[PDB]
Paper text:
Complex I (NADH:ubiquinone (UQ) oxidoreductase) is the first and the largest enzyme of the respiratory chain, catalysing the transfer of two electrons from NADH to UQ, coupled to the translocation of four protons across the bacterial or inner mitochondrial membrane. In bacterial complex I the 14 “core” subunits, necessary and sufficient for complex I function, are shared equally between the peripheral and membrane arms, together forming an L-shaped molecule. All known co-factors of complex I reside in the PA: the primary electron acceptor flavin-mononucleotide (FMN) is connected by the redox chain of seven Fe–S clusters to the quinone-binding site (Q-site) at the interface with the membrane domain. In this work we address this question by building and analyzing atomic structures of nine different conformational states of complex I, which were obtained by X-ray crystallography and single-particle cryo-EM.
In contrast, binding of DQ substrate to Q-site, in the absence of NADH or NAD+ in the NADH-binding site, promotes the rotation and tilt of the entire PA, including subunits Nqo4 and Nqo6 near Q-site, correlated with concerted changes in the region of the nearest proton pump, the E-channel. This suggests that motions near the Q-site can lead to changes in the E-channel and can be driven just by DQ binding, without any redox reaction. Other key residues, such as H384 from the key β1–β2 loop (33-QHPSTHG-39) in Nqo4 and M516, also contribute to the stabilization of the quinone ring, while secondary residues are involved specifically in the binding of each ligand. In particular, DQ interacts mainly with the residues mentioned above with its hydrocarbon chain surrounded by hydrophobic residues that complete the stabilization of the entire ligand. The presence of DQ in the Q-site significantly alters the conformation of the Nqo4 β-sheet, pulling β1–β2 loop (residues 32–39) about 1.5 Å inside the cavity towards DQ, allowing for stacking interactions between H384 and DQ. The opposite Nqo6 β-sheet also shifts in a similar direction, but the strand flanking the Q-cavity (P386 to F416) remains in place, thus effectively moving into the cavity and narrowing it. Therefore, as a result of DQ binding, the entire Q cavity undergoes conformational changes so that it “tightens” significantly around the quinone headgroup. Strikingly, this coupling was the strongest in the CXIDQ structure, because it was augmented by an additional edge, extending from the Nqo6 subunit. Despite the overall similarity of water networks, we identified one notable difference: only in the CXIDQ structure we observe the presence of a single water molecule nested between E32 and E67 of Nqo11 subunit. Thus, placement of water in this position leads to the formation of a unique continuous path extending from Nqo11 to Nqo14, that is, a path connecting the E-channel and the first antiporter.
Numbering used by the authors:
A (entry chain K): 1 to 95
B (entry chain N): 1 to 427
C (entry chain J): 1 to 160
D (entry chain 6): 16 to 181
E (entry chain A): 1 to 117
F (entry chain H): 2 to 354
G (entry chain 4): 26 to 205
The structure:
Amino acid sequence: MSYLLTSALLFALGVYGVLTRRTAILVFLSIELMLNAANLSLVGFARAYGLDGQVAALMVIAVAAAEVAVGLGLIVAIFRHRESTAVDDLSELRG
Amino acid sequence: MTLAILAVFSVALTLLGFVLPPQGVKRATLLGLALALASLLLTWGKPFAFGPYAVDGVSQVFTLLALLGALWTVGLVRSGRFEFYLLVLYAALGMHLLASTRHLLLMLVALEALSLPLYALATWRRGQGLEAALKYFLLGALAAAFFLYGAALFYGATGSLVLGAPGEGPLYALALGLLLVGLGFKAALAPFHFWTPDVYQGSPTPVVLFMATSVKAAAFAALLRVAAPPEALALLVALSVVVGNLAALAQKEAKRLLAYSSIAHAGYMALALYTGNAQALGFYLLTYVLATGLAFAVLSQISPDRVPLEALRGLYRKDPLLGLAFLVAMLSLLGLPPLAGFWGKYLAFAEAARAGAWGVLVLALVTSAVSAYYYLGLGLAVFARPEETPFRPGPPWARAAVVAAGVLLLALGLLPGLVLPALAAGG
Amino acid sequence: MSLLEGLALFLLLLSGVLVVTLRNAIHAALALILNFLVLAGVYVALDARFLGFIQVIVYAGAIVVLFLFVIMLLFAAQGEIGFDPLVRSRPLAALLALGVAGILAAGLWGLDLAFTQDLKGGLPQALGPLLYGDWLFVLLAVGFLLMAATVVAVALVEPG
Amino acid sequence: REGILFTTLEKLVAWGRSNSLWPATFGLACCAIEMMASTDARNDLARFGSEVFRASPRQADVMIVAGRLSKKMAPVMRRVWEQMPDPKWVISMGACASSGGMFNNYAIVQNVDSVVPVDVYVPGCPPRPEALIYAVMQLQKKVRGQAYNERGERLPPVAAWKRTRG
Amino acid sequence: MAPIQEYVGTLIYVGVALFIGVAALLVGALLGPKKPGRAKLMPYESGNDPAGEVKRFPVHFYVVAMLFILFDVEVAFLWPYAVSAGGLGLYGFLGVLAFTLLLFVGFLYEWWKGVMR
Amino acid sequence: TWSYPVDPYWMVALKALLVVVGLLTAFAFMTLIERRLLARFQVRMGPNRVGPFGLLQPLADAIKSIFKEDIVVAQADRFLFVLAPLISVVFALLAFGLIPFGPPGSFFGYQPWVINLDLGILYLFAVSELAVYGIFLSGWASGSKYSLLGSLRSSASLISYELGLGLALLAPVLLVGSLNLNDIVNWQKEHGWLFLYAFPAFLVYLIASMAEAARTPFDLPEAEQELVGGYHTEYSSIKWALFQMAEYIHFITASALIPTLFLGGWTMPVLEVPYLWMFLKIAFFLFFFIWIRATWFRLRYDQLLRFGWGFLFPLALLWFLVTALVVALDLPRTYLLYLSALSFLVLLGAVLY
Amino acid sequence: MTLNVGPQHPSTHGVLRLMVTLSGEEVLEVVPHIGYLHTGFEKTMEHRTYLQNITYTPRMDYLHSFAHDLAYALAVEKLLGAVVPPRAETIRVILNELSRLASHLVFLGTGLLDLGALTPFFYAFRERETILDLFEWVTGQRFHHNYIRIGGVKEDLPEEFVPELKKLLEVLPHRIDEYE
Ligand SMILES: CCCCCCCCCCC1=C(C)C(=O)C(OC)=C(OC)C1=O
Ligand code: SF4
């Protein structure tokens, strides 16, 4: 149970990352932290409920890898020409 | 047995774009989507299950809606970049996989597989489009994190990751809420709706068409499978409809206002989740798909980049058929008799009242009455004096499509007793 | 067990503190890699062994390497640039962060379960038959997702 | 701590340094081809310890000044000598390096001892490679404290220890 | 399976090795002339500005590394198939075959598009 | 670890220290032997000096490397600069104990190995990635964009071929069916010399093994002769020694791994002596690789990546799918004998035109 | 990368300074900077005897030096109307082309070494040493030989030279074929 509570704490920490971090790339880092804490909880419950959560966590890692590739391509595309990746400077579209 | 054709055509055209011009790639994409649609028809009421992949009425109808939207949005784009269409097939398949399963993890895989090409296809190089894509991307990945923690706590609450499992108390409710967060975010339910206005304003008009039809369709196809409790459902509906319409009042731009209207319509659709009829919701989503596809086809004929409200006025004088279809669509999104949008509205409200949640329904109905302001400010201006406005009078393809959509809306407003039987398992 | 497990958890927690705290992208990435190393250790401790070594192989070896490459190609080391500070967001989100902890803590406390099943070690030997078989369809879906992600990134740059 | 002031250790460490001399060439001119020849397949500086040749200055102790030193090139050599690890020696290869040689004019520094502490000189134009071998032998037996000048003195083992650098 | 104590031994290995490693650094630190000067700290090459200030270096490295993450994911998928192959019979193989095509297409894709980028 | 016993903790730690000092002595003597072999190749001679036979040069070098002003460069990151050599050295030293030098008890009583983890190749794969980690982390840490370029090339190339390693090494696991190397060795004892079956994949492994700093990708890069490589150009006394030491350690590690997997890990068909034949094959690969060190040019890592990407890895995956097809149908193994013999004959006969 | 390919580093033979304006692995534009070896021949020669100047001419291009000494000799001979005996001329072309082969040998050695393989630097240089011995046989110097004179040559070739030159001329073709 200590491991799953630790997963909760790490998920919360990655949430504070995404809320806090100013630059796109560090936000993406926090996103990976969150997803991997989730996979930790999956591993705990996979130990508990019969081993399916392990293959689950593997597929989750693959998904995270794919969306990391695309998200980093995008982060590059926006701020290769542009100034700092900092996301608070993007306010053109307002409600 | 549709997935066979989807995989075949996707993989084939993927490589073929290297040897074949993008125009031929587009022709092949249209043929592939049409053949997938035909396969869906010939499988009407013929469930096919191999793994957790389960073809049922929900998957059938909702994926048919998404296929129609994809066909329509492919019709418009003439890009000399075949990639701008390949993702469509990809995206299409993703949404299909979202509907055809109850498995949370494969549902997540389908979510990402359909959402990534959406993130990419909103890039006309237009500066605001990139901001839109980035905001959408970050919020989508956050929602995937939420849904994944919900799946983890679900696998904790039950030995399987399939919905409908017995379910515990507070832990199962917690998992349900964590799943509902991401799913409603994807379905434009408040207070998880913030992404939709920015995304619809920034994204190119045909892409917004494809999204506002197929994304919401597949999202609700997934949502119906959840055991969504009444209380959270009520709160999401109330806030969604209220915020959507009220803030929609002040909008000066067509596409953004359509985004807020789609948030309010997500609020409306979320009622059937009380009983999860999925037949009445199927019909509701059919009407909405027709209306929104029509309206955004018009918006794409006018301007892919951006359309302000005033630009639409006088649209009747140019083309009468289009003006009539646009006004019919305005009513269908308002839910006014004798149009099928009212049929979907009434169906969702019946499913709600049967569950016995009243005050939320009252608030929803008052807000729908409020919506008449802008539904009219768009419908009625159709006759007003046209100011200077760019108009490119379309091909015959889109004209026939818009006319067919309007005729279908009026018919199913008059004669819904045709399709509604065949929105269950095939009764 | 608990003796070293507590220390491992404290290392994980401190690594998370840094990976969300440190302003230097490189410092952050290294903290994350130490996190994944400890996390693979925990996985192995949790009778799931193959997954921890794939975690070190793929995530450490492949991805956060690429992140390092990007933050070195895109300097970005002093992330705190272009502030638009919104200082109110610093504590507030933390409370929301605290919120998102407590609820989950509330969600999982008083929960004791069957943490004893004969997995016989999470070797890929035993992972195969589930993977190819019952789970083969998810595998094909993942492969298709990867194919789509490749094409997406390619068309995403594709200068003309 | 400088490896000094213990009867056994200083002898041993100086022995080691002497035999492990890692040259960092500062190739300038025609002497440098004979310097390359000091390792060739007929007369190789591949025994005394100077086989390995890290042209980087962060990985070498002995600096072999091989050629004419134009004045624009002087401060470069100044830094490159300064850009060495501190136990460093400067060997002056060729006539042009030690004195002005036949080029006694505005173009060349007339004594390298101006910018860097020169330890050992080796005349010749060019010095036969074996003159470079004898020069590195001079420096070798020097750092052991086994070197005497015509004044008779024991000379300090390391030059670049005797300068108020600045 | 295999005993867990061996994995424990692995950790002990690092504990010793790292320790001697750190010890080496300590030795290297203590035995030194330690004569700090401005020019010794200079980055490189004669006065200032070895590279200087320019625009960002090529993302080609990002391309290679992203490629690598996806294909290493592929390899991590292939190993469980590599171990348990016969017991799954042709059926099992069939999946990975189609699977391979998918990522192979990806590779083939990036081959027919190429990276001069 | 079905069939293999376990030693006490204290003996594990002491074996660790023993392997450390043995790698010190061994890599020092192999630096000597590389000097001498390079010299012997180019008709010039080695150090007939400070020996008698030259075997006192490493001591002089080690004495010089210390006292050599271990420097902390200003304008460089304070902590990472110190930390990186430790990373590169530690993650190079470890992950060599797994390689068995004999049957159990052939260590004068206990055990040839240190640890015999059930998942060997995965552990090796991880530490292979982490060595390059240390390398280019040092490259950045120096704060010289000169060395930055070199560290970038290093990581890119080595990691590309680190990918290709898996698509190569799949096949022998298919045949053996275990991830503990000792099972693979015993497999090579009964059926024999795995490489005979897997020549093509073996090739793309050998070429891949060249990438891990051995020589001729040779855009490692070395500080010498090109845009200076990473992990040096800023290190003076002990850290530079640590870097090159770890590079040599990984060198001999690969030269020992290649025989164990594909060829005949010690386990000789004839005369079956525990250590000596393994050390002889290690020295053979070392001599071949030093032959390469002397004999060939650079690659610029652009054509190198084109080569690995388009040529090596498709070949490795093709062979892997063939082997998996066979094992799934399992009808004979002989079809692989036939196809591998033909593959070697083809990859050779195209030379003699 | 406003990169400073410095003088003599990185191991660029022929010490030269390059300001490579560069992004990535291409080459945008290299701004050359020289002046780091200017010795002042064209000035000092205004203060040296004609005969003396043969002490100066070869030490500029140290690979193909005897071509410099030969060009100087011919220039002055044409200037003051000098006559070269045919033997002097023949030995002149022989030693000059011999230093031509020496130059090409070191050229290929340093080329392959600077980027590429290190081994073939030695064999060529091995042969080069024989060439150098030849010069030491006749001129008493490895290279930079002060042999030619305005009228002709310093002195005759010693008795021991010619067999060594034939030896080298007999072994060289196989050597060159090997390199090719
Ligand atoms: C085994 C390594 C031996 C090389 C030692 C000398 C370093 C290389 C630069 C020296 C050099 C200079 C100055 C030089 O001017 C020159 O001629 C253009 C060379 O070769 C053709 C040189 O090699
Ligand atoms: S002393 Fe002679 S060989 Fe040496 S640099 Fe001067 S001119 Fe050249």
